[PDB]
Amino acid sequence: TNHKLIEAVTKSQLRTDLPSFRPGDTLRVHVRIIEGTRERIQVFEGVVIKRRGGGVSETFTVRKISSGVGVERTFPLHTPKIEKIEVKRRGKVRRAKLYYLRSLRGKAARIQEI
Amino acid sequence: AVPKRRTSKTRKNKRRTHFKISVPGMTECPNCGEYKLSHRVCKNCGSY
């Protein structure tokens, strides 16, 4: 065996409490912010734009609009700085990377449900 | 592009010492026919 060592050595850093989700789903990610004072937790909520990689290198990106400014945010899927992940909506898309949402606004940038 | 001096006989023939043909392979025909190219059933009398 030579083909399993990466999978074997990093197997203990996979997390198992994560829900399943797809691009198009709407997530509420509870992330923990460690300023020097405290260990507070803040939720980023938006649409899953992207999902890629495998193993411990897997990675997803969520997008929202904050004050008229679109903000996107990319996390390692197995990071210990995500406290929990809630799936709020199921989107209906035709496509695995929804980059066409970066140039839209309003009722144009609206994702159907289920 | 031009040579300033003509090259002599000795420099020409010193340049041609690697310019030659290598000796071929010859795994011999044991069943029938002329000796064929190595690892071939060659097209003239091949009985590999």
Binding site: - | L37, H39, R40
Partner: protein, 120 residues
């Protein structure tokens, strides 16, 4: 993979013609690069023919040429029919393989390595 000295479309066209003539004739003679490439093409075709259903028949039509074969006792089949009919029955027990390559000498006009590729 090899490029065979051709553009992308020319190479696809040449490989489809090579694989079709091998199905027609069951041994053909070509240059050694080309046969080393047509190994894979015709072996995936024979795999599709062994699988045998409609979806793989439609996948196999994407590659074979539409060539008619004059068969013994004066009959006629297309090459898709010979592939899904005859050739798929020979290789139903063999798992892979199906083509053999035998070297020849150089050609006369170049020194190109000739080769015979044959079905087994």
């Amino acid at each position: 993979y090899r490029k065979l000295g051709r553009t992308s479309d020319q190479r696809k066209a040449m490989l489809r013609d090579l694989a079709t003539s091998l199905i027609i004739s069951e041994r053909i003679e070509t240059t050694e690069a080309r046969a080393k490439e047509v190994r894979s093409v015709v072996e995936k075709l024979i795999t599709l023919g062994k699988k045998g259903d409609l979806a793989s028949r439609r996948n196999a039509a994407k590659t074979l040429r539409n060539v008619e074969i004059l068969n013994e006792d004066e009959t006629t089949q297309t090459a898709l029919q010979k592939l899904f009919g005859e050739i798929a029955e020979r290789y139903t027990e063999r798992q892979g393989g199906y083509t053999r390559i035998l070297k020849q000498g150089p050609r006369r006009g170049d020194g190109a390595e000739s080769v015979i590729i044959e079905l087994v």
